[PDB]
Amino acid sequence: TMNLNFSLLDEPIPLRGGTILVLEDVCVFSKIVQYCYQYEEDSELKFFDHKMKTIKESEIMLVTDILGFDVNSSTILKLIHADLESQFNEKPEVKSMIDKLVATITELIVFECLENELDLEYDEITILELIKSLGVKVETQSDTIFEKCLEILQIFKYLTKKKLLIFVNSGAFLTKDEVASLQEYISLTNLTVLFLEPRELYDFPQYILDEDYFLITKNM
Amino acid sequence: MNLNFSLLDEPIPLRGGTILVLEDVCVFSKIVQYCYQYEEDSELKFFDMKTIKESEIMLVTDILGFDVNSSTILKLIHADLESQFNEKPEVKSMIDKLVATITELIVFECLENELDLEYDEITILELIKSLGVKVETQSDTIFEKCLEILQIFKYLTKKKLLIFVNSGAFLTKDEVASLQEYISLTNLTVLFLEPRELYDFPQYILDEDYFLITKNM
Amino acid sequence: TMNLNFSLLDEPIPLRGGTILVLEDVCVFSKIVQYCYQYEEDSELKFFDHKMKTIKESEIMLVTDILGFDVNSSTILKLIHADLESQFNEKPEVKSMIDKLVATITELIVFECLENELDLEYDEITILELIKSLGVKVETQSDTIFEKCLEILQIFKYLTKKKLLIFVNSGAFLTKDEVASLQEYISLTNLTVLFLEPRELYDFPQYILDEDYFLITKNM
Amino acid sequence: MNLNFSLLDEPIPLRGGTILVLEDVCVFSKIVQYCYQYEEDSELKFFDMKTIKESEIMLVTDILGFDVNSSTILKLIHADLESQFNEKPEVKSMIDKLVATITELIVFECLENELDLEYDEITILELIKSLGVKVETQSDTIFEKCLEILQIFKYLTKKKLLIFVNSGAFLTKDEVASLQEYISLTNLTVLFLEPRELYDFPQYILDEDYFLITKNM
Ligand SMILES: [Ca+2]
Ligand SMILES: [Ca+2]
Ligand SMILES: [Ca+2]
Ligand SMILES: [Ca+2]
Ligand SMILES: [Ca+2]
Ligand SMILES: [Ca+2]
């Protein structure tokens, strides 16, 4: 489906499902990593899907610091909250029930308000405020770089707008089993993930890359 | 408590409501002003005999423009409404149970969501915050708003005295009479600095001659 | 020129220059004061100039707390700064000189930057940053409600977009002399100012107002 | 200083540059990870014999994504550039005089303005702030940026050790060699946790057997 293509490359590389990509040469390795952080419209490196429609900065999700990756970023949390709200909208028997419950709870407070001396006014209580007040956030149970990768994988999956995930030099932290559970999940869930590796990652189906930008396959 | 300074033979006593007329245009302006710039060694003094710090004094000049929806005041209102429920365990308990139901319907959405989500609680305080309860001021009459200023004043426990500058001019005798009753009832300490005599309530007067009188007792 | 007109009024009141306006009745007094704080499009009270073009919330400047009035509000300061900048633009021989001076001063710093280890980049230094850095602000010398009124008057004058000033119940703080110096300045500077007073302000030309909304003049 | 924990017969010594290879995939991951969650009683230890607090340790995993334009770092850069002038009184003095001229042309505009305006001074620090001097990163190579991380590291005096996780993979031997020279020259203390041997520099190795070796001395 997806392509990694730029000037110095013979053929555009296929990014289909899980994909390990070795860049033997230290210089091509950094060049490519860095062209990744530097990804933008004006960029050396182009990623695009089958329809040749190019993946934008925003659609890529790039991880080098696996531990550092924040699963409860505000950006993620806003989305989750907004998402949980729209779940309600699609079950109208429950939004009705939420509505009745808030309407009632509101009166009971306004009751105390009327009771209070002050001329007190008020707005409404929204589903979002309830979710936000409840403190819904992503579970952080993973206590290992490996467990973490899976969570990053889960989240990547969860963000429908993030289309490609790139782990950079992540092989270093992963038993052959772990790498396989990962690729397992990635097959299972239909994720396009790229692993920019500096050396061969065990004996998994994977692509390699000369200092000359010549492309061999391996372990098929 | 007391108001004192150098020109006064003897300090002025501030229990509950205390109306102070200054009829010398220039002494009115000096005293209102000294009040406003009040500090540790200001020319003008206030005390219990421990002197009131500035921070323990609120001063209202512009009534309608005074913000009674300050954070500290909201925070206070809100904990007060909450605590109104601790007097009504019956209803509070229903609220706990209603909140539990919302919680459950939300957690169910949380499970049904692909992500492994955790959560905490929803508290009555959060519901109150969420509801955006605040004092309504936008339509007020000066009188209505004086009352609100008084009502919020009771909360600021830190503050010991509230001063009203030249508010009389805006008030019907009956309105003034209301606020006295309320001041008296709420065990509050309040001063109205006036240019002129305020109808016929008990009040103090200092003239051009600087002779301090007492009236309508 | 300007008019104070609303429903309960016989004739629209002329606001020309300084203007004292007594509202004998406690109720009409508050009603009117309050209709002032509550001024907006949907409002009881209308102010408009000669061309019957109505003065907006923003064009009025309403003072009850004379001491409290902040002459160094951010809003005032932004304007002053922006204004001082445009002074420069209109003296091109001086903007040239400012320009030469900054361009030079910049190099001398960039010089130190080049000298510094780090790859350091930089932007520019603007006239505004110079003004802001210099800490230009309005002088606060007035140590009396009276001195203050004059400063508020100066500022009112300074804001070309603020078209009417209303002092509310300010008479209370003002010797007959002071009131006169004020009206003096207001004549001198061409200001439209209104003094909502609850009682007669000495013996100055002024308008009075019945509990019935009947309008007499006085002291002409 | 030193890195120590339970599996090590004897602590590892951290003077200047110190490269530490962990070749057991699982011990690499454990140690990188322990580093990251380091605290008071973490499994992993660091000390002078007073242990380094977490706050005294900076850790780089994502090189290009690390923010060297932090407030604390800018604040520091800027006071350093200023102080570069105190070594050049001649030029500084011209700058004082140039600034005085701008000041004067501004004050003149201040007088010419209808309002009575006051003012303070313009300082070199303000000019530097205004100028928006910061480290340029936007075009960096990983190597270039390591260098900048090092260069800013010298400033944070609070921090005692900087750790680089698995940065080797990105670096030419000659690039690595550069950063060693610079570390050595700047009297800095630095650790590179590596999965594999880093070319042929002096470095420490811990294997699957957990046998600690020393190499290329
Ligand atoms: Ca709300
Ligand atoms: Ca909560
Ligand atoms: Ca009200
Ligand atoms: Ca700038
Ligand atoms: Ca300055
Ligand atoms: Ca650079």
Residue numbers in the entry:
A (entry chain B), C (entry chain B): 0 to 219
B (entry chain A), D (entry chain A): 1 to 48, 51 to 219
Q: Mind quoting what the paper says about this structure?
A:
Mounting evidence indicates that CRISPR and Cas proteins represent a microbial immune system that protects against invading foreign genetic elements, such as plasmids and phages. Csn2 is one of four Cas proteins that comprise the Nmeni subtype of the CRISPR/Cas system. The results of the mobility shift assay indicate that S. pyogenes Csn2 has a non-specific dsDNA-binding function. The tetrameric nature of S. pyogenes Csn2 results in a diamond-shaped ring structure with a positively charged inner surface as seen in E. faecalis Csn2.
The only CA2 site in the asymmetric unit of the S. pyogenes Csn2 structure is located adjacent to one of the two hinge regions in monomer A. The calcium ion in the CA2 site is coordinated by three residues (Glu138, Asp142, and Glu150) from monomer A, Asp118 from monomer B of the symmetry-related dimer, and two water molecules. In the corresponding hinge region of monomer B in the asymmetric unit, we were unable to locate a calcium ion. Based on these observations, we concluded that, indeed, no calcium ion was bound in the potential CA2 site adjacent to the hinge region of monomer B. This may indicate that the two types of calcium-binding sites, CA1 and CA2, have different affinities for calcium ions. The absence of calcium could also be a simple artifact caused by release of the calcium ion from the more exposed binding site during purification. It is important to note that the lack of a calcium ion is not a result of the selenomethionine (SeMet) labeling as our 2.9 Å native data also indicated the absence of calcium at this site. In contrast, we purified and crystallized S. pyogenes Csn2 without the addition of excess calcium ions.
